[PDB]
């Protein structure tokens, strides 16, 4: 029986957007997207967003710490919170026949927390753990220091509660943070695997913390610093970037494409990346194992663009230089009209594949319905992508070779170059 | 402190058995007749009665083979008492001592020595004085004259009664006319102590701040003096009825009133 449905998307008087899509999957996945994150933190309440992330299972006004976990697990459901420096998602999954049950807890967690002091106190030593496992990937350490070297505020804020603040966050801070950010005009109630009327009747007759846009993040001031971390590691991770393009920006697609042209991740297992100019460039430079990619982040009011490079200590010099020369060589028209064609395909494919996942799809849908209120059709996003001249790409490249660069590196930097030696 | 308490009840039972068999050793009239009266009670247990008793006696009546095994037991049990006492204190040390206000004393603890080593030594001489005054100035005040007569199986003493410390139980024994019920009633008079931990209803530990429970407590104590007294009297009116009243109120107070008044007091504290 079931067939082709259409992606409805209402918007209540309070500005609360509701996205919805029925793909008759035997499983549902509802979520609450929110405009919040370490970006809105102040030197005064740093880490509070992180702790809030771990606090998802604490007692609420409607359900208890015990009932939340037991209740969800009872119907084989799940509940998690993912978040970037400027967005927080609270989503739950479960079989179609339990949506209504799992919904209560989701609703409770995001709109009715209690942050009981004792619960909060016992939870804090956990930031220490959570953070320790994350930092096992050097990958995460330099990115923290990158945003710190690339900015003077908002985005400069770490994504993981700083050490000195563990155990010092307070229920007041958690409450204020939620009251001032989790507001109807900053939230979207997305939801794959469900009928739109249903997901809507929920959002309204149920969500209460509301109205306004509360606290507004300070503008993203660019600093252009260089943070270096000497720690012994045989491998040196380095990332050199420049102010890139914001989200919803026309200049976005240009960079994304310059990304693939330079190379953004392997497509063939253990295989070399020929289609990767950057990879290939560095390859000809060093002889030992390494890795190099095009780094590209798009934020609300800013973004970062550059390359990231893992390499043996003694070869970080040659490897980073190479990564550079390959960017300059590209800003000087070193881009075939074909390279631009290949990229555009890799980008469209990458995009298209990155939506087969229930998670990936919900993320896609909700990301728009929050920082927009509309759903850009796949054909449109396609039309926007290829509609990028070979010039745009060489310009993007220019903007990098010209702009003020900020660099973050960590390992045995004994042979790593300083930002002013590039 | 359940385990400290239960090992304590065991210490009490062992202490009683010890004193009981020790009392037979001089082999005087009350030695023999007490042994005879009490051990015969058990031939009232169903089916295995007469068997268990004749086994214990090592024959058909309290006779020489009973004496020799009672001496062995009397020599032995005290050592078991010493052993179990170590366990008693071991469980006790798990928690430490309770105190008269019944609230946590972790905020104010002192080393056993010299505070309690001195307090206890003083407590030793304070008690030891009345002890020796009795043992030296009135040696037989507590003993039965009947025991200055060699045991005679063909001459029942007129008043077969125990030592003061068993009287209260002897009273309860005789309160229930019916060999079997009396024996159980006797047993229960002491085994009742294993139930106390389960009949606590108060929200507070002690009776320091529980006036109703305090009077009930002194009623109980007075109840026991009465039973002690009844136990030393012949089985006749008015002693018989008074005996059944005190035996009955004894169990009522521990099984019914204490837990009831405890709850009642919880309500009067708005709990």
């Amino acid at each position: 029986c079931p067939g082709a449905e259409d992606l409805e998307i209402t918007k209540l008087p309070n500005g609360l957007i509701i996205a919805s899509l029925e793909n008759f999957s035997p499983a549902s996945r509802i979520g609450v997207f929110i405009k919040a994150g370490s970006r809105y933190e102040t030197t005064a309440n740093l880490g509070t967003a992180h702790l809030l992330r771990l606090a998802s299972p604490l007692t609420t006004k409607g359900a208890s710490s015990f009932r939340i976990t037991r209740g969800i697990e009872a119907v084989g459901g799940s509940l998690s919170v993912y978040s970037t420096r400027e967005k927080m998602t609270y989503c739950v999954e479960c079989l179609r026949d339990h949506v209504d049950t799992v919904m209560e807890y989701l609703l409770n967690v995001t709109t009715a927390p209690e942050f009981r002091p004792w619960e909060v106190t016992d939870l804090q030593p956990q930031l220490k753990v959570d953070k320790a496992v994350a930092f096992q990937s050097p990958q995460v350490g330099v990115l923290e220091n990158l945003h710190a070297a690339a900015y003077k505020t908002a985005l400069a804020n770490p994504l993981y509660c700083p050490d000195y603040r563990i155990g010092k966050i307070t229920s007041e801070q958690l409450h204020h943070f939620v009251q001032n950010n989790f507001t109807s005009a900053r939230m979207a109630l997305v939801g794959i695997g469900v009928k739109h009327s249903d997901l809507k009747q929920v959002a309204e007759q149920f969500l209460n913390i509301r109205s306004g846009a509360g606290t507004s993040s300070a503008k993203a001031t660019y600093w252009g610093g260089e943070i270096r971390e000497q720690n012994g590691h045989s491998l040196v991770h380095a990332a050199v970037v420049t102010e890139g393009a914001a989200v919803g920006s026309a200049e976005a697609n240009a960079f994304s494409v310059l990304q693939h042209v330079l190379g953004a991740g392997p497509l063939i297992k253990r295989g070399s990346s020929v289609t990767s100019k950057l990879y290939q460039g560095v390859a000809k430079a060093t002889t030992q194992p390494f890795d190099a990619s095009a780094f590209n982040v798009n934020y609300s009011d800013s973004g970062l663009f550059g390359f990231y490079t893992i390499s043996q200590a003694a070869h970080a010099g040659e490897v980073i230089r190479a990564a550079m020369n390959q960017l300059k060589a590209a800003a000087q028209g070193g881009v075939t009209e074909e390279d631009v064609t290949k990229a555009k395909n890799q980008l469209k494919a990458t995009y298209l594949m990155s939506v087969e996942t229930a998670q990936g799809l919900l993320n896609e849908i909700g990301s728009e319905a929050l920082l927009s209120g509309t759903h850009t059709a796949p054909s449109v996003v396609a039309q926007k992508i290829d509609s990028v001249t070979s010039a745009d790409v060489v310009n993007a490249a220019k903007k990098f070779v010209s702009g003020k660069k900020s660099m973050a590196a960590s390992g045995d930097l004994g042979s790593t170059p300083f930002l002013d030696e590039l | 402190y359940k385990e400290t308490w239960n090992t304590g009840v065991i210490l009490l039972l062992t202490l009683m058995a010890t004193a009981f068999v020790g009392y037979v050793l001089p082999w005087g009239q009350m030695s023999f007749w007490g042994a005879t009266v009490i051990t015969n009670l058990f031939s009232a247990i169903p089916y295995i009665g007469h068997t268990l008793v004749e086994w214990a006696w090592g024959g058909f009546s309290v006779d020489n083979p009973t004496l020799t095994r009672f001496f062995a037991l009397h020599f032995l049990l005290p050592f078991a008492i010493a052993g179990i006492t170590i366990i008693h204190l071991t469980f006790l040390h798990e928690s430490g001592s309770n105190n008269p206000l019944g609230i946590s004393s972790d905020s104010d603890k002192i080393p056993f020595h010299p505070y309690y080593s001195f307090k206890d030594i003083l407590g030793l001489t304070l008690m030891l004085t009345p002890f020796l005054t009795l043992a030296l100035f009135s040696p037989n005040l507590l003993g039965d004259p009947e025991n200055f007569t060699p045991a005679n199986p063909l001459v029942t003493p007129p008043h077969i009664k125990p030592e003061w410390y068993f009287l209260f139980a002897y009273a309860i024994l005789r309160s229930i006319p019916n060999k079997l019920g009396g024996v159980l009633a006797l047993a229960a008079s002491v085994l009742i102590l294993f139930l106390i931990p389960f009949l606590h209803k108060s929200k507070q530990r002690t009776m320091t701040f529980r006036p109703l429970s305090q009077t009930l407590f002194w009623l109980l104590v007075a109840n026991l003096l009465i039973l002690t007294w009844i136990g030393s009297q012949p089985v006749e009116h008015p002693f018989i009825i008074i005996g059944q009243m005190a035996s009955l109120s004894y169990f009522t107070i521990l099984l019914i009133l204490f837990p009831t008044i405890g709850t009642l007091e919880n309500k009067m504290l708005n709990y």
Partner: protein, 442 residues
């Protein structure tokens, strides 16, 4: 409703090419897709002298074919935005590609070209030789895999299943262009292969493109015959690799499992769901429904633990693995075995009722995307010789009840000599005898 959504799932089409190859697929309305070939080969099919060949072959499968050399090959896949990946286990190997449905046919050609015409360039082999030797040193520092290897090494000591998938340092230092060629020619054959695809693809267009590039026909009856492997004997035993200098200890314990075909595997999985898993980052913490999870939390018993039911054609491994600090190994093990005994003796309808929902969500979650749906098809055919739809799995899972979990578990766990592997600062875990005793009486 859940029930209906299950029924409306597009059927998996399977058709056999006369040369012995089976083509299967699940057509969805997706612009992107995954097609690949799942082969009934692996280290179990290897021998003492070619152990590691299939892995060595995995390293070359992508360095170009005869029709189109390395650079050419990579450049052709990359330039179309397709993702080429694959792997090799003990009884299964796979090479699959993710691309737009539009290229479904060009993909199929690339696949067939890979499995049938691997170049096996002599200069390449000497390079992948050094690479594999490093991957060995890297994987050597992954306690979790070092542990499961050891678990197999002993659980199946003296057999084929006792070998690692990567092979030995010697086998890798000496394998020859021949051995690799031989391995491929011996194992990658139509009857033992399955070409599965999922996404927006026409079963027809698929099989047509298939007949065209998977031509190779057989003459003798042997070529159409799939070889039955000699059975592997299970051994209750232990292997203790002690290194107190390691930060945390790893311990895996398992009893012999029934093997793909057995229906009990359904119940076994339901069982593992009751016990479940844990790791210090689970937010549910002390309120998790898993009793072992709750204990681990309350008493700080371990950094993590998992239950598993690894199936094979004729056998399997049903057990659990945990990571703990030197001084909590004993209690963890004690509690863990305790939970197993609970399974056999006192499972509750409430427990199974929940274990079932968790399992359902699990099976459904394994079909989230094209690659995972394709991986399922490749496997279902290769192991069950057909596709088992969620609608069916659900039917089977729903028939499971307390009483049934107890009987099945008792049957596989109760009073059995388990296989034990322990690595790290394992002094506190001890005595096979003691562990063997944790195998009976709740």
């Amino acid at each position: 409703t859940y029930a209906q959504t299950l029924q409306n799932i597009p059927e998996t089409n399977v058709t056999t090419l006369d040369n012995g190859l089976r083509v299967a697929s699940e057509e969805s309305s997706q612009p992107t897709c995954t097609v690949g070939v799942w082969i009934g080969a692996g280290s179990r099919y290897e021998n003492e002298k070619n152990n590691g060949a299939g892995y060595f072959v995995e390293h070359l499968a992508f360095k170009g074919t005869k029709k189109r050399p390395c650079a050419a090959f990579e450049k052709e896949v990359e330039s179309m935005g397709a993702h080429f990946n694959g792997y090799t286990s003990r009884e299964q190997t796979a090479f699959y590609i993710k691309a737009l449905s539009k290229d479904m046919p060009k993909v199929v050609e690339l696949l067939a070209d890979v499995v049938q015409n691997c170049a096996l360039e002599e200069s390449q082999i000497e390079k992948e030789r050094g690479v594999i030797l490093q991957e060995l040193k890297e994987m050597d520092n992954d306690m979790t895999n070092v542990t499961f290897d050891y678990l197999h090494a002993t659980a199946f000591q003296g057999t084929a299943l006792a070998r690692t998938v990567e092979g030995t340092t010697e086998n890798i230092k000496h394998l020859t262009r021949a051995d690799l060629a031989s391995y491929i020619d011996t194992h990658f054959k139509a009857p033992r292969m399955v070409l599965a695809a999922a996404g927006g693809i026409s079963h027809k267009e698929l099989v047509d493109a298939a007949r065209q590039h998977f031509s190779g026909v057989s003459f003798t009856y042997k070529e159409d015959a799939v070889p039955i492997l000699p059975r592997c004997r299970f051994t209750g035993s232990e292997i203790r690799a002690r290194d107190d200098a390691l930060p945390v200890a790893h311990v895996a314990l398992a009893v012999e499992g029934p093997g793909w075909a057995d229906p009990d595997n359904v119940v076994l999985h339901v069982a593992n769901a009751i016990i479940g898993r844990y790791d210090r980052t689970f937010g549910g913490g002390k309120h998790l429904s898993s009793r072992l999870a709750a204990l681990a939390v309350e008493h700080k018993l371990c950094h993590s633990f998992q239950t598993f039911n690894t199936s094979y054609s004729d056998t399997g491994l049903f057990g659990f693995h945990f990571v703990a600090d030197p001084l909590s190994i004993d209690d963890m093990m004690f509690c863990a075995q305790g939970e197993w005994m609970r399974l056999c003796t006192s499972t509750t309808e409430s427990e199974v009722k929940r274990a079932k929902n968790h399992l359902r969500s699990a099976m459904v979650a394994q079909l989230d995307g094209t690659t995972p749906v394709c991986e399922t098809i490749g496997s279902h055919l290769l192991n069950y010789g057909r596709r088992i739809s969620l609608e069916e799995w659900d039917s089977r899972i729903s028939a499971v009840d307390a009483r049934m979990v107890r009987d099945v578990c008792s049957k596989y766990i109760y009073d059995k000599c388990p296989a034990l592997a322990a690595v790290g600062p394992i002094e506190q875990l001890l005595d096979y005898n003691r562990i063997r005793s944790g195998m009976y009486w709740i």
